[PDB]
């Protein structure tokens, strides 16, 4: 069937799938933040790092994903060019904050697993709070400084028209921004996470497997969600017209979804498990 109505169905069908994602992203992180904020037994260094990730993921399905839903289903932009400039800046700021924090929990956790005596003495709260400031300082620098200041802008006529058009909100970057930002937001944190969980797997070698299944869920769900999108960013930088917007957006949305997983991966502690149910009016 192909009329002028069969389209207004796949739209409502995609439209509710998006509204699940947006809720799952919010619910999971509003629960994780309140858990750490209300329960004392959850005030660990590693948990300060779960928090920074939980605010990064909450802002995804709060300011980015909802507008993402719109722009797509609207099949256009209804917020103007400065709000386009702004929204694009949140998008990058949150993706960098999500991925940096994922790799900061990674180094931290390996340091405590490998050397718990150095960690206990060295990594303070007033050291950890400072790690987090830096995470958001770069996140900001890679997002608001180059997008907002026009340092990201493309030069080809197609983009020049889009940048001028208030109903246009297609992201067009110059060969260098896309590479530089991809290395900062993703590959550096990927490399770090690769060799950090590498030394966890190696120094370790029944109980050995179900715990090693874990760093497999961790490193996996992360790659399975962000490597597709970022390898495509590099391919599209080299060979122009080799990636379809259909594909590029579909790939970004997979990563947008990772933000909903993080609560399920990082908050599996028995104290989280206890905290969550008490808040969900089950315990006590």
């Amino acid at each position, epitope marked *: 069937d192909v009329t002028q109505q069969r389209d207004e169905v796949w739209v409502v069908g995609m439209g509710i799938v998006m509204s699940l994602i947006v809720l799952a992203i919010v619910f999971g992180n509003v629960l994780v933040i309140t858990a750490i904020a209300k329960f004392e037994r959850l005030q660990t260094v*590693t948990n300060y790092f779960i928090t920074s990730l939980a605010c990064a993921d909450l802002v995804m399905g709060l300011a980015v994903v909802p507008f993402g839903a719109a722009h797509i289903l609207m099949k256009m932009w209804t917020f103007g060019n400065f709000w386009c400039e702004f929204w694009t800046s949140i998008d990058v700021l949150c993706v960098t904050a999500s991925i940096e924090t994922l790799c900061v929990i990674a180094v931290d*956790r390996y340091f*405590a*697993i490998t050397s718990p*005596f150095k960690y206990q003495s060295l990594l303070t709260k007033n050291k950890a709070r400072v790690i987090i400031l830096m995470v958001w300082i770069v996140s900001g620098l890679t997002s608001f400084l180059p997008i907002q200041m026009h340092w990201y802008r493309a030069t080809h006529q197609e983009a020049i028209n889009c940048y001028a058009e208030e109903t246009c909100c297609d992201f067009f970057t110059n060969q260098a921004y896309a590479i530089a930002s991809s290395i900062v937001s993703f590959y550096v944190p990927l490399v770090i996470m690769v060799f950090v969980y590498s030394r966890v797997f190696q120094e370790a070698k029944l*109980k050995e497997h179900k*715990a090693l299944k*874990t760093l497999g869920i961790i490193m996996g769900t992360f790659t399975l969600c962000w490597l597709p999108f970022f390898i495509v960013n590099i391919v599209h930088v080299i060979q122009d017209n080799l990636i379809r917007k259909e594909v590029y957006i579909l790939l970004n949305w997979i990563g947008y979804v990772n933000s909903g997983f993080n609560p399920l991966i990082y908050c599996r502690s028995p104290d989280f498990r206890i905290a969550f149910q008490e808040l969900l009016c089950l315990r006590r």
Partner: nanobody, 119 residues
Framework: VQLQESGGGLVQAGGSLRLSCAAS????????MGWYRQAPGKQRELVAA???????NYANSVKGRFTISRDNAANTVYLQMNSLKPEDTAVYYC??????????????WGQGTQVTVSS
């Protein structure tokens, strides 16, 4: 899985003892087995700990005297307490910290081996 402590009991001051603790069961390859002492109606304080890779953390008071070691075959810890002063009289507990699930540490405790250093 349970922690099987022994070596506890009365001993003359300036004496010696060997506290042993067998972690009966499956415990992940990366872990820290240590000793914790409950002073007469006071707070629990770590005596000495040993990581399953090789590194220590003796509580500065027992440093020089008491010496912690471990077997990675059966997973048993030996705090050889020499020159036992009446300040060392406390309930000693066995404890294993368990890394992997790699994000948090599963804490395993023991019932406690009483040590009474008499003068």
């Amino acid at each position: 899985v349970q922690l099987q402590e022994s070596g506890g009991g009365l001993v003359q001051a300036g004496g010696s003892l060997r506290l042993s603790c067998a972690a009966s069961g499956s415990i992940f390859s990366i872990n820290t087995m240590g000793w914790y002492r409950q002073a007469p109606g006071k707070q629990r304080e770590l005596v000495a700990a040993i990581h399953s890779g090789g590194s220590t953390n003796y509580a500065n008071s027992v440093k020089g005297r008491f010496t912690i070691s471990r077997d990675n075959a059966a997973n048993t810890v030996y705090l050889q307490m020499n020159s036992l002063k009446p300040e060392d009289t406390a309930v000693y507990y066995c404890n294993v910290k368990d890394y992997g699930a790699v994000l948090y540490e599963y804490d395993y405790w023991g019932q406690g081996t009483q040590v009474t250093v008499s003068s």
